[PDB]
Amino acid sequence: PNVVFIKTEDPDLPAFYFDPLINPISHREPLPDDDEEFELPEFVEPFLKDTPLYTDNTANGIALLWAPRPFNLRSGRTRRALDIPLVKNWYREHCPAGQPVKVRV
Amino acid sequence: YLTEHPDPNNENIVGYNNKKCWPRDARMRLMKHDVNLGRAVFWDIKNRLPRSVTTVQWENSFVSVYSKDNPNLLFNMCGFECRILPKCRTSYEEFTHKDGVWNLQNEVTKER
Amino acid sequence: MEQTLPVTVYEMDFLADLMDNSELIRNVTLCGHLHHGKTCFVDCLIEQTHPEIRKRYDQDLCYTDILFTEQERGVGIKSTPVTVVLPDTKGKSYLFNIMDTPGHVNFSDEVTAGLRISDGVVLFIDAAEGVMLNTERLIKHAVQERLAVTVCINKIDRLILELKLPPTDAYYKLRHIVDEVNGLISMYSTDENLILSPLLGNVCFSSSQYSICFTLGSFAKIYADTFGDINYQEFAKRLWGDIYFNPKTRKFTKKAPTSSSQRSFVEFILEPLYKILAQVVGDVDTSLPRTLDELGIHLTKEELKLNIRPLLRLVCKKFFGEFTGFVDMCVQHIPSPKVGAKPKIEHTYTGGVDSDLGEAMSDCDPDGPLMCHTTKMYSTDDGVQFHAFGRVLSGTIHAGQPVKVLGENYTLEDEEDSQICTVGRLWISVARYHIEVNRVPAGNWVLIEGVDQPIVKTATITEPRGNEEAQIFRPLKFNTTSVIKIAVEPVNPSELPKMLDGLRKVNKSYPSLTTKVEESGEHVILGTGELYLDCVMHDLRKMYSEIDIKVADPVVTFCETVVETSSLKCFAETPNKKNKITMIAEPLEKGLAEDIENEVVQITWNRKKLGEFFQTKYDWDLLAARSIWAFGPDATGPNILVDDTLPSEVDKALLGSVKDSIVQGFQWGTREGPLCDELIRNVKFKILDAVVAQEPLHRGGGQIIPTARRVVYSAFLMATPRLMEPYYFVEVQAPADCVSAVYTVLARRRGHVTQDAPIPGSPLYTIKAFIPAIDSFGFETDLRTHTQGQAFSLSVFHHWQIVPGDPLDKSIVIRPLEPQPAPHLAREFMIKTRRRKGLSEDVSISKFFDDP
Amino acid sequence: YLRKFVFEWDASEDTSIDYNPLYKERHQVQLLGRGFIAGIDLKQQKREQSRFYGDLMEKRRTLEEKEQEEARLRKLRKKEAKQRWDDRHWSQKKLDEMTDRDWRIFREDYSI
């Protein structure tokens, strides 16, 4: 399935924000009658009403969800400097369109 | 032939000798009917000869069929690999003079 | 019985006890679009009911999709049955038979096999992608099969962790999805009783990746558990549907206070979910313990050290708990086998509910006559023996019991297609293990053993020495049509029999597969697409016949038609030189063949209603509306046979004596066709004249059937013949930029783009197109490679469209290996197919006539 | 249907010599206009990108969103210009602005 993660460019914007990349949704029910006697007790409120919807480091975490493998984790095991190929993903991907013959080979 | 040597799997094509020297479109095309006919002809010829007097092996022989499915008639004779292609059959082209080609013509009408 | 089984929350004795009570059984098919989370949802249920089975932190474990090809591809290929015991919201355990169907459109036939033995459908819709092509097709097929429908809006986390929509915008997206599903249902169903809305409990919101499954009732019960004084049912009634909440009066009103307060769904359901997810993914180390304490969830130090995705899964499992919302949705709205038996018998059983045995099966009583009905054939790991899978509609099947198995051709008048077989064993079919049981009562799914021999696709299991009036269930009507045709031969002909055996086996494994042998001795396999045939050939090469197999390139099966009436009234006599039949052929009106195919008209109707329909919808003459004989080759075939013989010239009583023979000849001729031995489509055959021999022995039998086929062929040929290519409908889910590139691909394959609308609430577009099937080979690969994999397409058969060329054009020259231009493509498609079938080089218009 | 120690590879070993236009000119990835291929200069990627998504934003963004993006771009370009102005060429660096690193760059980059 196509990951449709929208990357945030402006840190000032809210973490949960309708980015212009997302296609705007064109708006337009057996509802109970309002006159009925349904009452909510005073002990009842939203589960995390006090909890803010987003924090300064929420978009950063959501970005870290879709980071490459060495950054998707938060705990891990140390590796040898030999064992880390810094450029393995570079040639694992497609060669750039405009390149000479020798670099393609 | 199939009454005496039945072939339910159409296995008659697996061992059919063909002249690999010619290109694929020039060889014999192993149609089911053509392969069965070639095997039947060879079987009849072999049956005509008692085995003790002489033996006609299939691996050392070669049967080529020309029909509505095969346009080329192939045979090896005296070291010459000859392939006859009739003019009215899969030619559709003007022909020049090439050294290795023999222009066969009917004697009574002198027509190629 | 007694055997080794994995550790489960419930007990096997309880599972067997639930099977006896048909009021606590739910036969459910989890269908949907490709990769919409059905298999992951089943895996979540299995994890809930099996403590020892746990999903890997990195790899999404799939309890279903057990095949090696399914594991490697990652795409569900065959339906997997799973029988579990699931607790409801109140705690009442229900027996659930879940048929996890594949999401790919090519395997839609599989879903049909899962829809015949199910009473309810749960359609899984991606919360990000929304309604796709397969969801619409499955909605149409389910509501056309008379099944209850519920919706699971899976992957709601994509609205939070991928799109990062505001909670109100997420609510808008969900509401739009629900509205679109409701519109589709109303379009495909005349009745408006089955309105789907989360207020009614028909809709559940789920994220199988993180195990977030809830309905309004379940989450209201969560509120009731955390605050005892609130009643969950009324709260769930008030939670959805633009009803705002006033905390000054603690009351729910349709009028929005403060002009800035969110809906009940956003305030009470969506916003807490957003807060939980954001706290876990953003503020784990700094602020996760406080929110965990506020929710009553306590996690160990080793549990809090997990990565973000496993931590989300754990937190949401601890919060929402069991998938009780799904159980509510499938208990309140999906009929039990007791309740839902009557529609199933009225729809599938050939004899109808009015028959005595139909009335017997309407009760679904375990102590009745045996009327099991199996629609799947599951191969063992060794691949030698097959187990017939299906539900028991009446009576009780016992292990080691003699049984009469009826095939698809079994009828009361002709009972030859029936075999007495001894059942070997009975298994309750869980995904990766099977619970051997001694007996299975009515209303449950079973893997009958030892009955696979006399059945290829569909079976009717009954008891011998009884049910002398028992009939078969209708064969599976399939969502799409199998078109892609491939020739198959062995590398070594000496091992031809093995492949043949393999063919039989694949014919049993794939419900819509069609394997035959043409006149040229060429083995032919029909499939619905390139992935479907790839899976079929992998099975044919590795599972069933271990031999090397050569596969020809893929070609499509064309249809034959006419575009204008026959030039002259064609005629044919019998070899007896008697019984002259004179016919003409003309094309049908627009949409008439579609009406016939879609069961809008049936020959089983009486003369009055059929004549009235043909007189009002298509303005036929009363004599023409009453003289119709048969519909095409099969039942509801696209062709029509009529007799215009006025009674003055031809005796109607005498013609009725040969009516059966003439109808048989018509059906055979339309099934074969004279152009390239292909189905004749959308042609009206009129019997202008009919001489009939008076003596019975000079007519009927082998005299009039071939004569009728010959005259049908002549009438078809004299009328201007044409070929129909099959045109597939393609839906491409592509990014906004790639849309243009998509056109380019469809430029090279005669593809016509019908629409390129965006996906509301998603950054992608759905490009719809109509591509020829013959040109569709590699189109999916071309599109994905050209767009760097960002564009994905699914192609399904849509219709038949006339090939541009003229098949009967001997002037066209065709080089043996060249892509021919359009103006004579039909000429290429007729002769080459004629060579593949093994017929003559070309067909003449007067070949079947009598003058030459 | 029908020796020598070579340090550098030979050009005949090349692949991707296609004839299909769909495979020669392959539509590159535009990761919503916000993702970039690794290694390449970010400014070059920004300049040579398809600019489709820039048009999409300028068409869909509201006036307030346009002002927000304009302000963010103003601040980012101010920082970039400060870095560029600070990154004066060793010779370009003002006599008084020539530090030890600037003097080393002027001594190394010059031919003398």
mmCIF file of C-alpha atoms in Angstrom, chain A residues 12-101:
data_model
loop_
_atom_site.group_PDB
_atom_site.id
_atom_site.type_symbol
_atom_site.label_atom_id
_atom_site.label_comp_id
_atom_site.label_asym_id
_atom_site.label_seq_id
_atom_site.Cartn_x
_atom_site.Cartn_y
_atom_site.Cartn_z
ATOM 1 C CA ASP A 12 5.392 26.423 13.170
ATOM 2 C CA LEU A 13 2.432 24.608 11.610
ATOM 3 C CA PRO A 14 0.396 22.271 13.845
ATOM 4 C CA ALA A 15 1.421 18.627 13.735
ATOM 5 C CA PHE A 16 -2.111 17.553 12.751
ATOM 6 C CA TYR A 17 -2.753 20.014 9.932
ATOM 7 C CA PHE A 18 -4.585 19.761 6.604
ATOM 8 C CA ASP A 19 -1.650 20.078 4.231
ATOM 9 C CA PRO A 20 -2.476 21.440 0.748
ATOM 10 C CA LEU A 21 -1.012 18.247 -0.749
ATOM 11 C CA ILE A 22 -4.030 16.364 0.600
ATOM 12 C CA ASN A 23 -6.969 16.714 -1.761
ATOM 13 C CA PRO A 24 -9.651 18.794 -0.002
ATOM 14 C CA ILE A 25 -12.729 16.737 0.819
ATOM 15 C CA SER A 26 -16.030 17.885 -0.688
ATOM 16 C CA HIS A 27 -18.448 17.997 2.237
ATOM 17 C CA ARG A 28 -21.906 16.780 1.180
ATOM 18 C CA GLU A 29 -28.429 9.896 9.604
ATOM 19 C CA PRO A 30 -30.854 8.174 11.989
ATOM 20 C CA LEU A 31 -29.937 10.505 14.849
ATOM 21 C CA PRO A 32 -31.681 10.369 18.235
ATOM 22 C CA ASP A 33 -34.062 13.188 19.062
ATOM 23 C CA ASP A 34 -32.572 16.099 20.988
ATOM 24 C CA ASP A 35 -35.599 16.401 23.293
ATOM 25 C CA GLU A 36 -34.803 13.048 24.924
ATOM 26 C CA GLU A 37 -33.576 12.881 28.515
ATOM 27 C CA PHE A 38 -30.025 11.633 27.950
ATOM 28 C CA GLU A 39 -27.736 13.142 30.591
ATOM 29 C CA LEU A 40 -24.003 12.725 31.039
ATOM 30 C CA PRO A 41 -22.683 12.392 34.609
ATOM 31 C CA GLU A 42 -20.295 15.034 35.903
ATOM 32 C CA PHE A 43 -17.608 12.370 36.356
ATOM 33 C CA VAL A 44 -17.592 11.850 32.583
ATOM 34 C CA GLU A 45 -15.287 13.805 30.275
ATOM 35 C CA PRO A 46 -13.130 12.987 27.233
ATOM 36 C CA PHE A 47 -10.474 10.419 28.067
ATOM 37 C CA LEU A 48 -7.515 12.759 27.607
ATOM 38 C CA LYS A 49 -9.158 16.189 27.637
ATOM 39 C CA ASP A 50 -6.272 17.637 29.652
ATOM 40 C CA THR A 51 -3.749 16.079 27.261
ATOM 41 C CA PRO A 52 -2.827 18.421 24.379
ATOM 42 C CA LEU A 53 -3.575 17.093 20.910
ATOM 43 C CA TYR A 54 -0.001 17.650 19.698
ATOM 44 C CA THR A 55 3.353 18.650 21.160
ATOM 45 C CA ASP A 56 6.416 20.399 19.722
ATOM 46 C CA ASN A 57 8.064 16.995 19.138
ATOM 47 C CA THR A 58 5.063 15.132 17.708
ATOM 48 C CA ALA A 59 5.700 15.790 14.017
ATOM 49 C CA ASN A 60 9.304 14.728 14.627
ATOM 50 C CA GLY A 61 8.144 11.368 15.967
ATOM 51 C CA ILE A 62 5.659 10.883 13.137
ATOM 52 C CA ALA A 63 8.510 11.579 10.714
ATOM 53 C CA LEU A 64 10.701 9.093 12.597
ATOM 54 C CA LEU A 65 8.017 6.464 11.973
ATOM 55 C CA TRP A 66 8.862 6.536 8.248
ATOM 56 C CA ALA A 67 12.610 7.129 8.541
ATOM 57 C CA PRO A 68 15.106 4.670 7.034
ATOM 58 C CA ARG A 69 15.900 1.564 9.050
ATOM 59 C CA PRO A 70 18.788 2.893 11.222
ATOM 60 C CA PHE A 71 16.451 5.705 12.329
ATOM 61 C CA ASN A 72 13.138 3.826 12.603
ATOM 62 C CA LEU A 73 14.407 2.353 15.880
ATOM 63 C CA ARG A 74 14.887 3.930 19.284
ATOM 64 C CA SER A 75 16.872 1.094 20.898
ATOM 65 C CA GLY A 76 19.391 -1.116 19.159
ATOM 66 C CA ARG A 77 22.689 -2.959 19.201
ATOM 67 C CA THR A 78 26.003 -1.300 18.395
ATOM 68 C CA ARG A 79 27.585 -2.231 15.062
ATOM 69 C CA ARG A 80 31.130 -2.267 13.754
ATOM 70 C CA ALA A 81 32.225 0.710 11.684
ATOM 71 C CA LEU A 82 33.100 -1.845 9.000
ATOM 72 C CA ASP A 83 29.586 -3.302 9.053
ATOM 73 C CA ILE A 84 27.853 0.007 8.250
ATOM 74 C CA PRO A 85 27.695 0.663 4.484
ATOM 75 C CA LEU A 86 27.091 4.397 4.231
ATOM 76 C CA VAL A 87 26.410 4.276 0.482
ATOM 77 C CA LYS A 88 24.726 0.882 0.066
ATOM 78 C CA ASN A 89 21.293 2.453 -0.395
ATOM 79 C CA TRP A 90 22.798 4.801 -2.995
ATOM 80 C CA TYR A 91 23.480 2.086 -5.569
ATOM 81 C CA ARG A 92 20.566 -0.046 -4.373
ATOM 82 C CA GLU A 93 18.307 2.596 -5.920
ATOM 83 C CA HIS A 94 17.922 3.418 -9.601
ATOM 84 C CA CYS A 95 20.749 5.281 -11.290
ATOM 85 C CA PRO A 96 19.995 8.986 -11.869
ATOM 86 C CA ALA A 97 18.598 9.689 -15.319
ATOM 87 C CA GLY A 98 21.403 11.952 -16.500
ATOM 88 C CA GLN A 99 24.667 10.085 -15.940
ATOM 89 C CA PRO A 100 27.632 9.079 -18.126
ATOM 90 C CA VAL A 101 28.156 5.511 -19.305
#
